[PDB]
Amino acid sequence: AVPPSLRLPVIEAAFPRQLHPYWPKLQETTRTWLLEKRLMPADKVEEYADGLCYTDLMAGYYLGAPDEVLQAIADYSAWFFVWDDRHDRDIVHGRAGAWRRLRGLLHTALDSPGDHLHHEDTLVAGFADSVRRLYAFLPATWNARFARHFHTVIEAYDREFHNRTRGIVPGVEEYLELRRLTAAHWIWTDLLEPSSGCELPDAVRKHPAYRRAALLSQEFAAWYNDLCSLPKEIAGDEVHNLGISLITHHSLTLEEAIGEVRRRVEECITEFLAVERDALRFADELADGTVRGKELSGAVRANVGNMRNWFSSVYWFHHESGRYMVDSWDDRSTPPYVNN
Template identity: 80%
Template structure:
């Protein structure tokens, strides 16, 4: 199967999807979209990575566009105002760099450096303006994204986002401790942890500033809306596991649904791939059902009042972007250099990472 990449040139190029990872239903029923701001988005995020010193200049030049981080977000939050789209894209790029720092801290046994970073991120999340000039570029850049993201909706939305991200930081700490001790989580433990390390509710929260509307709790917590949101994120997390399995086995990583299935359920590598793929396909099928339930919810919300109409329009927009997440995630995994381990000199060491901790040589 092929898609046409818009990632690194103005000339589309065919992208082949390996048969084991091909999902015809995504290619047929989930048309790919791209935010019209994308070309500018890519340029500005590349500049931001340099200005915030999140990646060395040579790595930004060689790898930033090919990693397709902006493509992933520009295929998701369709309809977002440009400034919201930019803030989300920069935050997403930061998240990938943080994930890489976490991985390198594990690999190099930098327990003190990780603990320090963990506490600094918690502090920056609660008072980002106080950390804009932090000596660790990762903390300062995070604070910058938080100041911007906190500017779009209300204090209540900010508090909700912060609550969700505090939990993500702690989940990364649990993963650090698991990897440091050689602990492979059980399937159920992993699924619970993955919802946090993949930041399911963070990406769902960001649907609201993209729609320009803060959803009331009764809508966000409605079983139909919550289920559709969860399924879109579960698909993304498990498809990521499917695609990153070779990378994570090479990197001695334990946190992958396939690895938990092999270690705790006695599956072979081939059997675990089949099972993860089955769960991925189940997410797609269940989302198509949940999508109809959310559309019915949107109809009910449109009760003839101005407020009801606004809520209905926002829910429909958020649902549309949940749908966009499927295609954006799918094609990202086949276009991004993040998963092309066969092209790396060392399959355990991504060529785009910085192996140094902040302030260390």
Template identity: 80%
Template sequence: MQAFPRGTTATPTAVVVPPSLALPVVESAFPRRLHPYWPRLQEKTRQWLLEKRLMPADKVREYADGLCYTDLMAGYYLGAPDEVLQAIADYSAWFFVWDDRHDRYVVHGRTGDWRRLRYRLHAALDAPRHHLRHPDPLVGAFADSVLRLYGFLSRTWNQRFARHFHAVIEAYDREFRNRNEGRVPRVEEYLTLRRHTFAHWIWTDLLEPSAGYEFPDAVRKKPAYRRAALLSQEFAAWYNDLCSLPKEIAGDEVHNLGISLITHEGLTLEEAVDEVRRRVERCVSEFTEAERDVLRLADDLADGTVHGKELSSAVRTCVGNMRNWFSTVYWFHHESGRYRVDSWDDRSTPPYVTNEAAGEK
């Protein structure tokens, strides 16, 4: 199956999914769409990466569009106001750069540098305005993106976002320690850790400013809403693991559902691949059931009042975007240069990462 035969990036190539990674149900039942702001989004995020010195100019020119970071967000947050989508896309691009910095620090054993970055990110999350001019571009760009995200909804939403991202930072610290020690977490421990390192609740939080509506706990914590949100995110995390398993085994990585299954459950590589794929497919089938429950919730919220109508509409928008997450994540893994490890000159070093961008000398 091909996605966007003319391509969403500057290179007009068709994408063919390897049979081992193909999910016909996603290709057929989860139509892919892009926010109409996408071309401008791509351009402005490219400019932002340059302005914030997150990637050198030559790397931005050669790789930024092909990494498809803006494609991923433009396929998820449909209906978002342009400025909201732009803030989310810049934050997402920052997140990928941060993930690369974290990886380089692990590879080079730079424990002190990681510890300092961890503390600085915690501080910038709580007081972004005071960190806009931080000498580390990664910290300054983070402060900029967070400050923009904090401007869309209430202080309560900002505090929730901060709480969720503090947990993400700490999960990255646990991952740093595991990788330094060569420790493979057990399956249940890994699944809990993965929900943070993949930032499940962050991407879910961002559905609300995209819909222009902050949900009360009575809606956000409804089992139906949380289940649909979790299934969409679990699909993304586990499909990423499925696509990444061979290269992560080759690279002595310790964080992958398949690696945990092999190490602690005694599965062969083939059995682990089958099990991860089974979990991915189950997320898809269970989401369609959860989606129906959320739509019934939306119907119940439409109580004849203006408030009820607006809340119901926002819930429908958010569950619709949870559905979009399946297709946008699926195609991202087959279009982004981030996953074309076989084409890299050095399989251990992404070509879009430089020593300077990774905080190295």
């Protein structure tokens, strides 16, 4: 039963869950990869990795992906969670230099991953492995777009490091802008493309219905994470959360803030339903009787289908994953799965 404050009856009724058939293999393969790359201690992998549901989250999202593509995505996704944990620990322990050096290595590795496959920092080596595999599916133009997007993401994490060290809580609009980067909206949007086997031309992926449907799917993901992760984040002195920007800067109570975040999330869903009709119409228009048109139509339809799947995968992930079960931790400020 989903806690009442978090429950979204529209998701439960109108966004039925899907699961990619490769999921059982995926779960074990990513577990093995976390182990082999030493991204988590073996005992924490054993006790917590499956319960974190990171592979489940991606297998409920990129339906239709080739198994090899889904594997690279899931390994990268598990890496991303461990990176969020590393960032958090560097902030909590005041390791500004370790963070600055990591920030610089990730920018460099992102451009030349094969050069970093055996880097001394296992977090950099794990990143490089997943990124080198992601760069082997589509043309270099897609790789460069992924890289452009993730450089921006790394810098947004750097801004978060400074806000948290300086005790600054961003304002609402400042936060909303920053959250499109820290949630990595455009990375997940880029990854729709190797999942359906096609780098989309700019004229297609920048069509306003495709752009808007893509944006709303990610706003939902980010803001619903804010709603569900708020208790862990308060306990951990995290300042980045739409709710916190509202408590801090609009004098809402915790209760009023949870309500406003929920209202924003609900409205995302019904705005998505409207634009989804336009995006699927566009998918239809592309099928103009030509071979290329059929290819583009098929890829856009699959991508818009997965933009829809992200809602249900994210919703259930937050209720299933150990990552947010702060009530179960002996020390609420120190999740058990993090390297402290």
